Amino acid sequence: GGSVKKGRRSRRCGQCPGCQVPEDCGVCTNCLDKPKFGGRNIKKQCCKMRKCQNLQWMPSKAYLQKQAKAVK
């Protein structure tokens, strides 16, 4: 259930508004959903301000399963 299926490889940049947030903004639905923000840690979702904006993506190869290694 928590595995990649209809998606591709993605890696957050690490220098955007999202990646620069190591804490909970405390004002977005996700954060406010936390007890410390009045919530109840029931929704405990990814902070809207934390979610990366720019990540490295690449086409999937689960359907092709081609080869791209140093065959020898």
In the annotated binding site for Zn(2+), the residues are 13, 16, 19, 25, 28, 31, 47, 52
Q: How far is the CB of 41 from Zn ion (least distance, A)?
A: 14
Nearest to 18 by CA among 44, 38, 46: 46
The residue from 8, 11, 16, 72 that contacts Zn ion (CB under 5 A) is 16
Dist CA 10 CA 56 (whole Å): 5
- Which residues contribute to the site for Zn ion (CB under 5 A)? 12-13, 16, 18-19, 25, 28, 31, 47-49, 52
